[PDB]
């Protein structure tokens, strides 16, 4: 399997929560976003694996993810992401 | 959870340089993916509302990708 | 079947515990499934002895007494 | 401070473990809910001991499975290990 994707139903419902209840979403549109999400994860992963691998570490940790986020233009995501981690700790 | 962590792990291990993963990494990606899905959908919906439509279309998502530098890495994923 | 975040919180009631690995809550989730299933089944034996259809707290306390595996539960479920 | 798994989740596992005509009293589910937390705390504290003695910091799979066998749940170790090999 090269390419794997999150289940279309999970992606679809998050999409439905991000628009008014009067909105409808085309089939192609969900699948498009489903593909983008896998690309987004692989994108961030590839930077984190580099930063991790270069501290001769073997496992990608939280810092490497958030570090990769800021590096690749998703620094605005880092602020909530740290909040998410607090609650489970 | 809202997104399956096990499936996120599988996407992570498409990279040759990843073969063991930490506990928090797929959890971070779950929330990040939810935020990302929300961000991309919202941006495409703004183009839908500006055109007084009610069906979000793939054309709209391709549009939102062009108009934000944050989505540059998605330029060859949805072409015109 | 069981939320791992809650299992993690139960683990960290132990004060000699503060950091946990990825695999510990997944082990405990399945272990908790087996434990709930075994304890319930073992208690159902006494439900059947009284030809009842409702499993009662009486049955679980009974099963705890009749298995050495549940010794740590004698002060948790008294009769 | 004391945490319990959701009573509905406990009830579902209990119900799959009984005949199709069987019912569970409110008393019984809540009782099992307490036992399950006790079971986790029980195994954890031995695992933390095994963990600390090898001057480790994080409790890993082996520390759990060692604690299982040490504390009378050796019958769990083989299924748990197989269960911790298919997801890996």
Author numbering:
A (entry chain C): 52 to 140
B (entry chain D): 41 to 120
C (entry chain B): 42 to 120
D (entry chain A): 53 to 140
Original authors' sentences:
The transcription factor (TF) NF-Y is a nuclear protein that binds the CCAAT sequence in promoters with a very high specificity. NF-Y is a heterotrimer formed by evolutionarily conserved subunits: NF-YA, NF-YB, and NF-YC.
In this study, we demonstrated that suramin, a polysulfonated naphthylamine derivative of urea, inhibits the DNA interaction of NF-Y with the CCAAT box by binding the HFD subunits, either as isolated heterodimers or in the complete trimer. The NF-Yd–suramin co-crystals belonged to space group P212121 and diffracted to 2.7 Å resolution. The refinement converged to an Rfactor value of 22.2% (Rfree = 27.4%), with a final model composed of two NF-Yd protomers (identified with A/B, and C/D chains for NF-YB/NF-YC, respectively), one suramin molecule, one glycerol, one citrate, and 47 water molecules in the asymmetric unit. Within the HFD heterodimer, NF-YC is the subunit that provides the majority of the suramin-interacting residues: located at the first turn of helix α1 and in the L1 region, they are mostly apolar and generate the homodimeric cleft where suramin symmetrically fits. Additionally, the C-terminus of the NF-YB subunit, in particular Arg140, provides an additional electrostatic interaction to stabilize a second suramin sulfonic acid group. In particular, the NF-YB Phe139 side chain rotates by about 90° to accommodate the two benzene rings attached to the urea moiety of the ligand. In the (NF-Yd)2–suramin complex, the ligand is located close to the DNA binding region of NF-Y, contacting NF-YC L1 and α1 and NF-YB αC, which are responsible for more than 40% of the contacts between the HFD NF-Yd and the phosphate backbone of the NF-Y-bound DNA. Furthermore, two sulfonic acid groups that decorate the suramin naphthalene moiety, in particular the one salt-bridged to the NZ atoms of NF-YC Lys49 and Lys53, match well with the position of two DNA phosphate groups, corresponding to position −21 and −20 in the complementary strand of the CCAAT box in the DNA/NF-Y complex. Furthermore, the suramin-induced homodimerization of the HFD heterodimers sterically precludes binding of about 10 bp present in the NF-Y/DNA complex.
